[PDB]
Write a protein that binds this DNA or RNA. Structure first.
Ligand SMILES: [Mg+2]
Ligand SMILES: [Mg+2]
Ligand SMILES: [Mg+2]
Ligand SMILES: [Mg+2]
Ligand SMILES: [Mg+2]
Ligand SMILES: [Mg+2]
Ligand SMILES: [Mg+2]
Ligand SMILES: [Mg+2]
Ligand SMILES: [Mg+2]
Ligand SMILES: [Mg+2]
Ligand SMILES: [Mg+2]
Ligand SMILES: [Mg+2]
Ligand SMILES: [Mg+2]
Ligand SMILES: [Mg+2]
Ligand SMILES: [Mg+2]
Ligand SMILES: [Mg+2]
Ligand SMILES: [Mg+2]
Ligand SMILES: [Mg+2]
Ligand SMILES: [Mg+2]
Ligand SMILES: [Mg+2]
Ligand SMILES: [Mg+2]
Ligand SMILES: [Mg+2]
Ligand SMILES: [Mg+2]
Ligand SMILES: [Mg+2]
Ligand SMILES: [Mg+2]
Ligand SMILES: [Mg+2]
Ligand SMILES: [Mg+2]
Ligand SMILES: [Mg+2]
Ligand SMILES: [Mg+2]
Ligand SMILES: [Mg+2]
Ligand SMILES: [Mg+2]
Ligand SMILES: [Mg+2]
Ligand SMILES: [Mg+2]
Lengths: 177, 104, 136, 74, 53, 61
RNA sequence: GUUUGACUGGGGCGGUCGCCUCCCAAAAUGUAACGGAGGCGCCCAAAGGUCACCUCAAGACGGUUGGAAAUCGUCUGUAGAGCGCAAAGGUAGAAGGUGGCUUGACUGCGAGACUGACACGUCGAGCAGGGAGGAAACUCGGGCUUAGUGAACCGGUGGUACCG
RNA sequence: ACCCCCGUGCCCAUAGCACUGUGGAACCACCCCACCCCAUGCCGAACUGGGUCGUGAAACACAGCAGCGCCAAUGAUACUCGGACCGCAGGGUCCCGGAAAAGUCGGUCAGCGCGGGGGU
């Protein structure tokens, strides 16, 4: 269930190279944020509950349905009822999912060279380039409604984008080559 | 967030009560509970987990709660008082209350 | 000239010129000596007048501008309310305020081009040069 | 149009330096304009009133720092 | 205070009997679930009976 | 231009700017202006000082 | 046999009568015009009581049938938001956003004051009978306040038991 | 008494921000794990609870610094109570005290307590 792999080798690699005042000054990962917008799904009272089971069965953590705020949007925004779903993964439950995806889920994408290496968050944080929802191991074309996808954000303690992609090594870090 | 405390500290209208203020402050596994004169710019009777390790398990607040209770009762001065902070009730903080309240 | 959406109405009062400078945006400029209203036209004709005497060049600057709406009798009497929304728009100017300014033309060049625009103006005026330099 | 309505009478009833009784009204204003200080209460309509007889005094620096308070005499 | 065919209503209270009244304004807007509340009559205190009609 | 410094014996009583280089649409900015003896620019370097304005043009009726 | 309103830069036609907010209003309050703008004749059994926690608008970067606008992420963020409605005041230690439990949107009074020619109208400490939330100091006799109203007469219903 | 730390006031930006330098077994903080107390309308991130090592990184604390903010004179002016006036009018003047806003000269990166822990 990992968490050992972050320990030892990941830390000194950047610490014995670029240097750090501490093992605490070493870049970390606080939380993996997973949110699937259901806005494209107008099913609402019918099938909105289905996407909750999708995210709950994969991360073993119940999703919280987000809300409208009702906005305007000039085409569709209304009141209220959910408009999307949300789950935050931190600690070992982040480390159960994160390891599960990089070893298993990521190779399941067709012609996968890895996510865009260009600057994501100058503050050091990182996203996921997930397009399809079917690419995940638990999801298959066997059981689905339609073809959709969800977004995932890696929240890291990296102080720089330079040191961001640096920590982002180890864990399954493909590139543009 | 840092308005957690200042929601409570202002929640008690101080000199309008006629009472005194008892500030319990937790940082480490140690707690310092001190009682302050609101009207005047001063404090009255201190306590601490500092010279302590009375109990091993925090809930050693029982001692410092009773320590204040006794240290204050020498000055007289027992009504209600009782400030609090960003910290909730029950648990470790109520081990302090019942050590003072009913213990003082 | 007449502008986009507003508060729509006004009364009247008069002080002395507040936000008009001595100089700006050019060598020579025009300054009003009497408290008054200037309309959407007038200054519109003043631009046309001045520019006609130039090469048509875009060297002219108009610091003034109509804001204040004025009203009029629909037909007559006192029957009914206050009325007359669009009658004309005016711009109040107070003495010492600088009205127009020109660029790059010579001395007599802008002397005569101010003089032509001197008429068409309800007030007496005098042109100028720069000594006081204020930008902040 | 012609539809404006009523006077509403909001003011500062007892100005600083004055000797209030118990129950007198110190200020009538709209929402918060003056904050109730020592010895001063506040009602539904806001509108500070006197909790204890004595001398009324005004305290402010800036903003919403305005305060009305009482103190006794003897 | 004015009354018509419309939504909400004026509804009286129960028997705190005592044969007693309260009558707060009410509404059928939320629900027709009726109602019961707590009040005090001549007899005792807090005898809590049901909104009538 | 406000500039500054150093000697107020030698103060820059004027500023010489050569315009023969520029023709039409050319905006000469404040970083192009010559200020000897280390007189730091008061305003932004890219602020426009001299710009030659194009000939009067019209098309539609 | 009678009725058939007034205002009104003559009367009529048209419009207008009560209530709340801003301007006029001349830095106290008050102040008119067939002056300049806009709203009310409700809603809320929870939008109330209390008890806890929560913090907004907007932009930039990066992200998935989702692009002006979505949902997520980080950064900025004295408020540029919100407060059921109309504006002004007011609000970040919140009145605004969320839950726990609730019936004080109580009976009996009412120190002393705001305001009115009157009649109305507004605020209110505190006392008792009883409760409600809290561990507690405490708060609660509707709502951020300011509109959501009708003297008396005559009468319907439930009490009460004074007259008879 | 002095240095300093933790708490808590008064003041209620001349005490605020960013750039930044010191600080670490004494104090703060993160960190550590948590089936249950307790608790996140998802996540113990937040509350909460069990405790070291580590770390001085983050947050905090103090010293630095006057680029930004915030305070900001004296001079003069605007306006004006009162007095006395010119213009057909828009408007304007004289005397008399009162006297701003902005701007410049500058001034700053605070002050003042109560209690307890730790060095000298
Ligand atoms: Mg006038
Ligand atoms: Mg100016
Ligand atoms: Mg009024
Ligand atoms: Mg101040
Ligand atoms: Mg008539
Ligand atoms: Mg008529
Ligand atoms: Mg008549
Ligand atoms: Mg009309
Ligand atoms: Mg007035
Ligand atoms: Mg007046
Ligand atoms: Mg009159
Ligand atoms: Mg009128
Ligand atoms: Mg008018
Ligand atoms: Mg609140
Ligand atoms: Mg209880
Ligand atoms: Mg009461
Ligand atoms: Mg009867
Ligand atoms: Mg401290
Ligand atoms: Mg040491
Ligand atoms: Mg943790
Ligand atoms: Mg820092
Ligand atoms: Mg002076
Ligand atoms: Mg003058
Ligand atoms: Mg005079
Ligand atoms: Mg005369
Ligand atoms: Mg004058
Ligand atoms: Mg005088
Ligand atoms: Mg004078
Ligand atoms: Mg003076
Ligand atoms: Mg000034
Ligand atoms: Mg300066
Ligand atoms: Mg400093
Ligand atoms: Mg000390």
């Amino acid at each position: 269930q990992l968490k050992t792999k972050y320990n030892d080798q990941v830390r000194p690699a950047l610490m014995q190279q670029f240097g750090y005042s501490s093992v605490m000054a070493v870049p970390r990962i606080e939380k993996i944020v997973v949110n699937e917008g259901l806005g494209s799904s107008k099913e609402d009272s019918k099938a909105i509950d289905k996407a909750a089971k999708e995210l709950a069965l994969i991360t073993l953590q119940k999703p919280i349905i987000t809300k409208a705020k009702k906005s305007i949007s000039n085409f569709k925004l209304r009141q209220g009822m959910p408009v999307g779903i949300k789950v935050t993964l931190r600690g070992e439950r982040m480390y159960v999912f994160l390891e599960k995806l990089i070893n298993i889920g990521l190779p399941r994408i067709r012609d996968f060279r890895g996510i865009n290496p260009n600057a994501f968050d100058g503050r050091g944080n990182y996203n996921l380039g997930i397009k399809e929802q079917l690419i995940f191991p638990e999801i298959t074309y066997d059981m689905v409604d339609k073809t959709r996808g969800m977004d995932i954000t890696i929240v890291t303690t990296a102080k720089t984008d330079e040191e961001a992609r640096a920590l982002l090594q180890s864990m399954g870090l493909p590139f543009r080559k | 967030r840092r308005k957690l405390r200042t929601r409570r500290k202002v929640r008690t209208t101080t000199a309008a009560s006629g009472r005194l203020r008892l500030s319990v402050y937790r940082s480490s596994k140690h707690i310092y509970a001190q009682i302050i004169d609101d009207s005047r710019g001063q404090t009255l009777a201190a306590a601490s987990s500092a010279a302590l390790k009375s109990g091993n398990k925090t809930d050693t607040a029982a001692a410092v709660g009773k320590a204040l209770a006794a240290a204050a009762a020498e000055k007289g001065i027992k009504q209600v008082v009782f400030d609090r902070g960003s910290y909730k009730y029950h648990g470790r903080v109520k081990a302090l209350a019942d050590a003072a309240r009913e213990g003082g | 000239k007449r502008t986009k959406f507003r508060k729509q109405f006004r009364g009247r009062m008069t002080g002395d010129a507040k936000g008009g400078d001595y100089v700006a945006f050019g060598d020579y400029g025009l300054i009003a000596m009497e408290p008054a209203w200037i309309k959407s036209n007038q200054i519109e004709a003043c631009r046309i007048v001045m520019s006609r005497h130039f090469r048509r060049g875009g060297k002219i600057y108009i610091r003034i501008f109509p804001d204040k709406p004025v009203t009029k009798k629909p037909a007559e009497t006192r029957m009914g309310k206050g009325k007359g929304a669009v009658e004309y728009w005016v711009s109040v100017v107070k003495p010492g305020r600088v009205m127009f300014e020109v660029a790059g033309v010579t001395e007599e060049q802008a002397k005569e081009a101010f003089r032509l625009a001197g008429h068409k103006l309800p007030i007496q005026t005098k042109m100028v040069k720069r000594e006081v330099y204020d930008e902040a | 149009n012609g539809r404006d309505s009523n006077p509403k009478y909001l003011g500062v009833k007892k100005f600083g330096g004055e000797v209030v009784k118990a129950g007198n009204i110190l200020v009538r204003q709209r929402g918060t304009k003056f904050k109730a200080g020592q010895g001063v209460g506040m009602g539904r309509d806001h509108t500070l009133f006197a909790l204890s007889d004595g001398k009324v005094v005004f305290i402010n620096k800036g903003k919403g720092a305005r305060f009305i308070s009482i103190e006794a005499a003897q | 205070a004015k009354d018509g065919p419309r939504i909400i209503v004026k509804m009286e209270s129960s028997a705190g009997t005592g044969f007693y009244y309260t009558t707060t304004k009410n509404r059928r807007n939320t629900q027709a679930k009726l109602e019961l509340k707590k009040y005090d009559p001549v007899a005792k205190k807090h005898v809590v009976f049901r909104e009538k009609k | 231009l406000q500039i500054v410094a150093p000697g107020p014996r030698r103060i820059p009583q004027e500023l010489v700017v050569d315009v023969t280089k520029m023709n039409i649409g050319d905006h000469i900015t404040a970083g192009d202006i010559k200020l000897p003896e280390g007189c730091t620019l008061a305003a932004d370097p890219e602020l426009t000082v001299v710009s030659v304005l194009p000939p009067r043009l019209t098309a539609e009726e």
